[PDB]
């Protein structure tokens, strides 16, 4: 682990506004962005694209031949951002849990030099508490300036 784990507190309505700002301020080579349902993966990818950014998405409601080709394109550096649900790429230096995961196991799969930013809503609080204790480690409120040494290669 060379991952630095932050959270931002948001409501659902602030999520896109929040991400767009992370898209501007972080120095991203590639990002992976996790949501909690295939519907939301699609909506967000569209949102990201309308805001002016490059964007692939994968989820479970796709043919495997199709999911695997997109994932391979992404691995090969043929897009900047990938929105996905749950399943490293060296160029990925930032991971965003647009939707906070529900189990420590699932978090570990998403987080396993990089940054992992969590979007925490009032409704994510028992999961945050439970996931922290279960892994030992704390997820610190997102600072005003993050040290490029922590996630930029």
């Amino acid at each position: 682990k060379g991952v630095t784990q932050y959270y931002a507190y948001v409501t659902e309505r602030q999520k896109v506004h929040c991400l767009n700002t992370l898209f501007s301020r972080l120095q991203i080579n590639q990002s992976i962005i996790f949501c909690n349902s295939s519907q939301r993966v699609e909506l967000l990818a569209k949102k990201i694209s309308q805001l002016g950014y490059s964007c692939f998405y994968i989820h479970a409601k796709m043919r495997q031949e199709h999911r695997n080709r997109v994932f391979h394109d992404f691995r090969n550096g043929l897009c900047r951002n990938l929105v996905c649900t749950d399943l490293d790429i060296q160029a990925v230096n930032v991971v965003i849990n647009f939707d906070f995961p529900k189990l420590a196991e699932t978090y570990l799969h998403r987080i396993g030099l990089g940054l992992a930013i969590n979007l925490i809503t009032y409704d994510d609080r028992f999961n945050l508490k439970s996931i922290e204790e279960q892994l030992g480690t704390e997820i610190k409120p997102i600072p005003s300036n993050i040290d490029k040494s922590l996630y930029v290669a």
Partner: peptide, 26 residues
Amino acid sequence: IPDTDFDFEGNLALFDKAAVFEEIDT
């Protein structure tokens, strides 16, 4: 969709993480 920065700091304090974790533990 504001062409302006999201206020992380302001929204961080809407939520007292220590207070909340203390309460749930009781």
